[PDB]
Design a protein around this ligand. Structure first.
Ligand SMILES: CN1CCN(Cc2ccc(NCc3ccc(F)cc3F)cc2)CC1
Ligand SMILES: CN1CCN(Cc2ccc(NCc3ccc(F)cc3F)cc2)CC1
Ligand SMILES: CN1CCN(Cc2ccc(NCc3ccc(F)cc3F)cc2)CC1
Lengths: 250, 236, 57, 278, 278, 59, 57, 278, 236, 57
């Protein structure tokens, strides 16, 4: 059977007994930087195993009125194990990721989720011509809430769901790498995202490589059961991570 | 060397191909890097699926409702689920889809289309649906007996939650106008209950369906035009 | 040092010459004669190849 | 070596007959994120058809290979305000809406540029207009970042010794030039989800990466007894283009020249009901 | 391959002598719908003649290979009415009579097009004319069907990013361009005996198939103290022509630009009697 | 490259044959089809019979 | 890549060179040197060939 | 012989590992006047990197291969003062600051020259301006040292028989010409630390070697009823350049066109203290 | 010969390459002579050392003081000797050096850099110094413990009076702007006492150090611009 | 008598023709295609070659 998948990175393993295939970015597997493409001179550091392992971020609660959530990487893993320490102590970094989003419910539940990784997901402020701090869009591993109605607080990003906070039709996000979690026939989605950027390496504190979005297209529904919500969990694992430019801790 | 200038000299044509001097002689460009995801033709984009907002009921307080087609239990027999015109570049349904956006940059189009439907009900729910494509005619179908005459597929809901209806390219001309009219009509697409939806005890009484639109491998476009969806009144 | 090549024309029912005059490649004319393309990158990004005839799952 | 010598139709349709088997091409599962690859031959009987259509016109090279206005500005030959007798435009490609949209369908771009300038003049209205003035001449100067910037029409900076410049006279063909891929990265970036300072503070967005320089224009020595106004239009035409990571086209109207700010918009228009087809 | 290399006279006349036989070339029967093929050699004695005449000038390529005006219009540089400062012409080839007639001798056509624009300007009469204005510049924009349409001279739509355009300055040679066979069928159709709706209702005639787009023209930035009027003429010149199904030339004068309507006309002129030859 | 313009430059002759730029680069034309009745010279038309109105009697 | 060919001239009592500069066949000059023709399509559209010497019926 | 046929990347970085030995690449001695040649690979572990960067744009040929203004002057078509109707400029390359600085980075130069002239005209302000004047024409004359010099616009000297000259008409492209290496030495000299007389007296400095001649400009025969002012700009563009003996760039502002005189200037700007880095 | 003028005719582009007539036909040029010291690329100049005025203390009555970094005996332990930003084309320290002048004629630069330090104390004096380069970060180092984490070299003073610190090219982009900003920062360089300076009896209590800056063999620049240091208001 | 030669272009991922029309070499276009260079003249002007690994003195 092809409905069972097993992934082993570092000293952690993920087993899903009911899943679809794995999607692989734009058909490119993560890999180390080549000699003929590099620019920095000094020797890089490659702490595999220590950093290439699964890290389960916190969990969210899926209610009948949920609208969606997003996380921004790699800042989401800023304080997660040795990955965070290496990112703090180095000027440059480079790594692909494997994203696994779990969500299980009985045969009598119905709903559908869209899981998509949006590279360079620039967002606009709630009030045009008004700047916002770096806290209404990323504050560690905590998830951020979309809003059904138009946002009004100037201190926050525009959270209108149907525009995805990017000024584009939400239904067109299918262009990016993605998967669907349909409770009828699925329990998890796996995405392998290679390193996509305009330069060989970049600082991980100043640049958000890509954004993860989970949007319920078909709202959750059930009847006459003792379960009131469906927890959702997200797990990530850097792949082929290498750092460079050692300096004092930020 | 005697010469004579022909008409058109000293004109500026915005779509010409001529050599011109370089303003930065012997400039060293940055080495190329193979970034993942290179795209070499807009059709590659056009063949990707995208959700179609079929539920345009003029009363959608919540915008997200536009992407879900209601379905009920104990439905009258042989009822219509939805209907729409096949005008990918003009109809409001396909106007803003990932496919529709590409066509609006062109004037002519041709080829077949794919409509994919996914049932997002419960696992215990079951049903059958009839999806039919009616070529152009004097009147659109009104009942299942009329619809079933044209191209159609009977969809059974089971372990496989998705079904694909391939709309064939039937036309008197090699190409069709994006700004479609009576002359270059394309027909209609409708869906009807085949058996009805049945559910066991302790399940929701309603479900939803979603539709995806994309182009086949024979699709193509021609003549570039400027899109009409975006406009400005003053310099930014 | 002249290049000869075919020009777009119809189907069922034809050569042009080009010469470069400037020493910088940026001055050349647009190379709009390339038609190779591959959509599998965005349409089939899965890891395990799926046969259309066989069931998806 | 006096010479040297140097097409792809869409897929055809194959004849198909009645079928009755366990294969089910129609049924699939979109949950995998994989778009189907069925063809009309897999669901109904079809005849054999040879397609001679080609996708030549949809290549990115041809899609972006059209000149488009990116900026226009006015300057007077003579006036009291010094700042009104010349133009100073920081270069950017986000001020005119159509070309901006077109570019914003791809995350990264790499191309050569072909620039064309269209200049026109007109006599300002006034009580006395009887005058005789020879043909006018204009100067266009490009100042890479960090170079000196003129402060008046007759400044010393207009004696370009390293800055490229063009001198043009009215009545001739529009000026033109070509520029190579002048970036500091391996590709231009339309979007940049990041900050300027390493403390996650400061400017945010593509503005951060916009350091292409400035363009200045002036009348060479024209100084009429009566004011004369001129307008300049700048056209860009990418060449040898490569693109990466397509993104959905924008839906909401633009509102700022250096930001993605917008206002929520309906997904699309409405109709009477789900069954209305008229 | 530095080079590569790459005529039909009319039939001659053969000598013929006296004849007396059962063959009767002269007698035939037009009821078959077959035109005869007799020659003067078959009815009277003839000498041998070598003809060097050729039918080169009567080929369809040469017959239609002449530029002809198809439209002319006027627009002012400055005026109170916004609609009077620019032109908007739906493209069609049925507005000028001569070129229309020429084309209408064939049912179907397939050709490339060569377009040339002639633009002239003149100062409007008035009480005060003393002014000095530099050379003017004009913009021609082509809008395929369904694209945005400008509503005023200074509209945003004039920033073409995909729509081809030409910027031209007075005093130079006329502008020119070439267009390929831009149809949606396998050939253009001068006539269409059918309706638009499948219920045999709606528009009727060639108008139905006319969807070639529009052309817009304006002064770039010229705005004179006093009005200046300009005129534009459009010339079309088919190339690489093929024609099918010839039809008799029109006899009645044209009366509508989008219809075949006419008034009955006499077959031809008259004379005194059937025998008058003077 | 030195050059000298001869008389006739910048003229527009309605019966000239010159190459000009294409406004729609890399446009894909519709495939050709052999419609019955192709005509390649007006003489072909000229050789077809037609009725002559000889009885022009002014009445 | 140049083409050489004859040019119309008289009878009893002569080459020009052409080169294509643009990448689109629509830009070429008019090919007004073709003189082949066949009127039998409109003058003899009958099914059974008729000999002029023989009686029509 | 119909044809004939006819790149240098920077150094790469080699992988280096931990080391512990008596070799000490880091330690050196600048007293020898020898700049080190260490590389980052000699002091810390490094990965293997292939550099495709090139130093093409920093060649002296490209550094100096840009046209730059070197002189501008005004002359009137008609006026009372004879000396005000024409220009007389002794040729030198030390009047415009930017080009002067650029050249002064090398002691000796040897190159061909490309000269371009930009000429513009304007009508002087006045009470009455209504006039009609055909296009103007200008003459540029080059007088090698020792030749006759005109004293008025209509002097006999303007009948050049050996002196090269250019006649130019407004509305066309700017005039241009090329000049060979016209020196009396084996190279031009920007500096000359010596005197003129052998007694160490007389002129001192580069002025001594400046004997390139003069340039004169005038309106051919234009003499308007009302004054018209014209301006000429001269641009130089070295070609086939060779340079010797580089010298440090100048720091103090220029103050004389034929001397090195200056005023003392601070070495550079200041900051709060030796540790401030903000 | 029919022809058509393309856009750009009759334009004057200051960086074009075209043939033009010669005004002095058949002119005999003077024979060439091989003068010593031919230069064929500005980088050759850029790789020569030059003194860096690090001592910009806003109180320099004597200009020459800018080139000498003070050092004392009996110094507090682990003290900072100097610190500066690594902006070769923008920072006041490197602005006017032989290297800085060349960069200011360009817009982009890349490659490694060399900083050479020479101890100009007495022959009997001795000491050790720590020189560290800190890549870009949120905050510059404040104490030796912070500095020693990044790239650094321990300098010992002996018979060899000079030590070289090679600043590696660590950057996210292939090139950096000369007019540097937050996005393209380059980091900091600092020097600290490792052991302190010790002197015997009868020697001066203070010494000085000098710094030299130059480019490695992989350095390069791009895009020519006009420098901003030199200006005029009136014709000379 | 035409010269063919390569033109600057990128790296990982191209010929122009030139002809001289004038009889004076000063009229030719700039020869900005030369990239040879040698900095040892100004960086290592010493008489005795010094090995970087070995001590300076
Ligand atoms: C934020 N990015 C800015 C650059 N944009 C592409 C781009 C880059 C450079 C240019 N022009 C560069 C240029 C070239 C030549 C000049 F004279 C002046 C210039 F500004 C135009 C568009 C993509 C978005
Ligand atoms: C009803 N048919 C209309 C077309 N006509 C032939 C025809 C087709 C197209 C054109 N021009 C197309 C065109 C080409 C280029 C443009 F810029 C604008 C245009 F309208 C001219 C004549 C035959 C009769
Ligand atoms: C003191 N030296 C004077 C020459 N300068 C170089 C130089 C030499 C000659 C020229 N131009 C010569 C020339 C050439 C052609 C002309 F018509 C007039 C001229 F003056 C320009 C710059 C280096 C410094």
């Amino acid at each position: 059977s092809d409905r069972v998948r097993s992934i082993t990175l570092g000293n952690s393993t993920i087993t899903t007994q009911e899943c679809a295939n794995v999607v692989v970015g734009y058909g490119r597997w993560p890999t180390y930087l080549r000699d003929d493409e590099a620019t920095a001179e000094d020797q890089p550091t490659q702490p595999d195993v220590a950093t290439c392992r699964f890290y389960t971020l916190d969990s969210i609660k899926w209610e009948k009125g949920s609208v969606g959530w997003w996380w921004k990487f790699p800042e989401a893993l800023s304080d997660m194990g040795l990955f965070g320490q290496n990112m703090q102590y180095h000027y440059l970094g480079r790594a692909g990721y494997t994203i696994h989003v779990q969500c299980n419910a009985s045969k009598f539940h119905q709903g559908c989720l869209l899981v998509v990784c949006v590279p360079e997901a620039e967002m606009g402020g709630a009030v045009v011509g008004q700047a916002f701090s770096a806290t209404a869009m990323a504050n560690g591993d905590k998830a951020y809430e979309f809003t059904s109605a138009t946002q009004s607080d100037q201190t926050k990003v525009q959270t209108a769901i149907h525009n995805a906070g990017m000024g584009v039709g939400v239904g067109n996000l299918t262009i990016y790498p993605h998967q669907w979690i349909n409770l009828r026939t699925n329990n998890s989605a796996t995405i392998v995202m290679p390193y996509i950027n305009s330069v060989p390496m970049d600082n991980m504190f100043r640049h958000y490589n890509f954004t993860l979005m989970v949007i319920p297209f078909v709202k959750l529904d059930y009847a006459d059961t003792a379960s009131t919500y469906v927890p959702i969990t997200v797990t990530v694992a850097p792949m082929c991570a290498e750092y460079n430019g050692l300096r004092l801790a930020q | 060397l005697p010469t004579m200038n022909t008409p058109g000299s000293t004109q500026f044509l915005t779509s010409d191909d001529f050599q011109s001097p370089c303003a930065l002689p012997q400039f060293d460009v940055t080495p190329s890097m193979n970034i993942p995801g290179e795209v070499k033709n807009l059709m590659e984009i056009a063949e990707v699926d995208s959700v179609v907002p079929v539920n345009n009921v003029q009363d959608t307080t919540d915008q997200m409702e536009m992407f879900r087609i209601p379905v009920t239990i104990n439905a009258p027999l042989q009822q219509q689920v939805f209907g729409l015109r096949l005008q990918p570049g003009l109809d409001s349904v396909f106007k803003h889809t990932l496919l529709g956006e590409i066509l609006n940059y062109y004037a002519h189009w041709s080829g077949s289309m794919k409509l994919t439907f996914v049932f997002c009900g419960s696992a215990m729910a079951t049903g059958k649906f009839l999806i039919a494509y009616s070529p152009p005619g004097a009147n659109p179908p009104k009942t299942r007996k009329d619809a079933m005459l044209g191209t159609h597929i009977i969809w059974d809901i089971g372990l496989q939650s998705s079904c694909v209806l391939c709309v064939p390219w039937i036309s008197q001309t090699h190409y069709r106008l994006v700004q479609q009219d009576e002359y270059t009509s394309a027909g209609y697409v409708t869906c009807w209950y085949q058996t009805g939806m049945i559910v066991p005890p302790g399940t929701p009484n309603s479900s939803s369906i979603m539709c995806f639109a994309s182009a086949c491998n024979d699709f193509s476009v021609r003549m570039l035009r400027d899109t009409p969806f975006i406009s400005q009144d003053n310099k930014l | 040092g002249a290049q000869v090549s075919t020009q777009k024309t119809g189907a069922h029912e034809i050569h042009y010459t080009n010469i470069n005059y400037y020493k910088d490649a940026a001055s050349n004319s647009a190379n709009r004669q390339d038609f190779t393309q591959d959509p599998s990158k965005f349409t089939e990004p899965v890891k395990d190849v799926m046969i259309k005839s066989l069931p998806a799952l | 070596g006096d010479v040297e010598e140097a097409v792809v139709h869409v897929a055809d349709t194959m004849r198909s007959g009645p079928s009755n088997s366990a294969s089910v091409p129609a049924l699939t599962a979109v949950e995998t994120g994989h778009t189907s690859q069925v063809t009309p031959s897999d669901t109904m009987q079809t005849r054999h058809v040879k397609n001679y259509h080609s996708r030549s016109e949809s290549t990115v090279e041809n899609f972006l290979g059209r000149s488009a206005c990116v900026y226009m500005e006015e300057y007077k030959t003579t006036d009291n305000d010094v700042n009104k007798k010349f133009v100073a435009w920081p270069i950017n490609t986000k001020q005119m809406v159509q070309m901006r949209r077109k570019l914003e369908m791809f995350t990264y771009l790499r191309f050569d540029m072909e620039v064309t300038f269209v200049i026109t003049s007109r006599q300002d209205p006034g009580t006395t207009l009887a005058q005789d003035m020879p043909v006018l001449t204009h100067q266009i100067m490009y100042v890479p970042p960090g170079g000196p910037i003129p402060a008046k029409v007759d400044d010393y900076a207009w004696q370009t010794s390293t800055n490229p410049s063009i001198f043009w006279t009215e009545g001739n063909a529009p000026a033109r030039m070509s520029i190579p891929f002048i970036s500091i990265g391996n590709a231009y970036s339309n979007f940049y989800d990041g900050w300027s300072n390493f403390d996650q503070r400061g400017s945010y967005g593509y503005n951060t990466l916009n350091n292409l320089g400035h363009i200045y224009v002036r009348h060479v020595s024209g100084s009429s007894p009566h004011p004369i106004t001129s307008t300049i239009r700048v056209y860009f035409k990418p060449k040898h283009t490569r693109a990466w990571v397509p993104r959905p086209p924008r839906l909401c109207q633009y509102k700022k020249a250096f930001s993605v700010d917008f206002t929520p918009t309906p997904i699309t228009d409405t109709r009477k009901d789900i069954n209305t087809v008229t």
